[PDB]
Amino acid sequence: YKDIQMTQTTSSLSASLGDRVTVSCRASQDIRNYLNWYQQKPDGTVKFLIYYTSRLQPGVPSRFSGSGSGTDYSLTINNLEQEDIGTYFCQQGNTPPWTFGGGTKLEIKRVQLQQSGPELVKPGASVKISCKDSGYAFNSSWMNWVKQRPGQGLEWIGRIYPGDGDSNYNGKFEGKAILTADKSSSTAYMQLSSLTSVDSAVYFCARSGLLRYAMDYWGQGTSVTVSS
Numbered sequence: 001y002k003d004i005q006m007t008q009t010t011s012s013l014s015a016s017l018g019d020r021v022t023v024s025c026r027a028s029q030d031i032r033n034y035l036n037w038y039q040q041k042p043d044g045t046v047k048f049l050i051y052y053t054s055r056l057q058p059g060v061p062s063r064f065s066g067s068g069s070g071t072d073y074s075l076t077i078n079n080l081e082q083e084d085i086g087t088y089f090c091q092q093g094n095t096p097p098w099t100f101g102g103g104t105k106l107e108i109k110r111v112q113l114q115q116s117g118p119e120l121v122k123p124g125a126s127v128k129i130s131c132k133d134s135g136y137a138f139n140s141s142w143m144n145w146v147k148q149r150p151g152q153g154l155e156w157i158g159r160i161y162p163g164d165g166d167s168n169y170n171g172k173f174e175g176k177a178i179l180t181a182d183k184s185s186s187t188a189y190m191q192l193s194s195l196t197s198v199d200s201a202v203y204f205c206a207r208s209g210l211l212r213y214a215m216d217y218w219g220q221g222t223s224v225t226v227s228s
Contacts, residue, residue, distance in 0.1 A: 001171045004028050004092055008101035011151075014109040015080055023075045023104045025068075025090035034094035035073045036214040037066060040087045040103070045111070046204065046218040050075065052093075082108070089154055093213025097170040098144075100154035113205055113219035120225045126193040129222045131205035138186040139163045141207045144215055145179065145190050149201040157203075160188065192224070200226045 005028040015021050025035065037050040048057050053073060054066040063078040077084050085108060090101040116130040131143065145157040158169035162181040169177065176199070181188045192199055202223050206215035 003097055003099050004031060004095050006090055006092055006099045006101040006153075008088075008090060008104050010104055011102060012105040012107070014107050016109055017080055017082060019080045021077045021080050021084075021106060023077075023088045023090075023106075025073045025075075025101045027071045027073075027092050027094075030070050031092040031094040033069060034092060034213055035066075035068060036091045036093055037075045038089045038091065038215075039084075040089065042086060044202065044221055046206070046215075046221075048214060048216055048218075049088075051212065051214050080106075091154070091214070096168065097172075098156040098213065100146075100156070102151075102153040111220045112217055113207065115203075115205060115219040115222040118223040118225070120227060121195060123196055123226055123228060125195050126191060127195065127224055128189055128191040129203060129224070131188045131190075131219050133186040133188070133207065135186075135217075137207070138181075138188075139183050141209060143179075143181065143188040144206045144208055145177065146204045146206060146215070146218075147173075147201050148204065148221070152201075157190070159208075162186075162188065195224075195226045197226050197228075200224060 007026050033053045035053050040046045049060050050066040053068050065076045067074050087103045087105040089103040112135050114132050119127045139162040142159045144159040147155040157173045160167040160179040178191045202221040204221045206218040208215050
């Protein structure tokens with residue numbers, strides 16, 4: 001296994017409404033500005049905020065700004081507002097496998113992709129979770145899968161292109177996850193096998209276009225608990 005390590009040394013920030021908050025991120029090597037930012041709201045949902053270091057995505061308020069180059073990047077929020085609360089994660093899109101920082105949870109001081117429901121299984125078993133896309137670009141988009149454990153940032157599992165069934169996997173999950181897709185029902189599936197407590201996490205599906213190295217839209221996530 002080989003990758004570019006992303007780190008957000010500051011895991012949590014406590015601030016007041018109106019402050020100027022900054023979230024920092026470092027890549028282990030030059031990622032040539034291919035650095036994206038996501039905000040995970042308290043309800044667990046994830047939204048794509050900035051692409052290629054500074055490109056705000058449609059709808060994102062002007063108070064947000066991205067800076068950086070080389071290995072160091074930052075997201076700045078001017079005039080902090082309540083809706084900005086959540087956990088911010090950086091992600092380099094320069095070199096597969098895509099990698100994410102550990103996230104920085106921001107607190108105040110004193111879906112088009114519908115995934116199947118929560119799973120609860122025993123060690124050694126397998127589970128198949130689904131992700132139905134109600135949109136119309138399912139077969140012409142990469143469907144990515146991401147793993148999140150408490151305090152374990154976010155890990156890119158792999159992706160599949162429904163159009164021709166092509167698939168790419170993160171070496172770390174090759175024997176663990178199997179990605180498939182049904183063109184007719186616009187549904188992508190991920191089967192996890194030989195489950196251990198390490199597989200206990202929330203898994204998200206997220207699609208991306210064929211030319212941008214970021215996850216455009218995210219499902220709500222599926223919780224998988226492995227229990228003895």
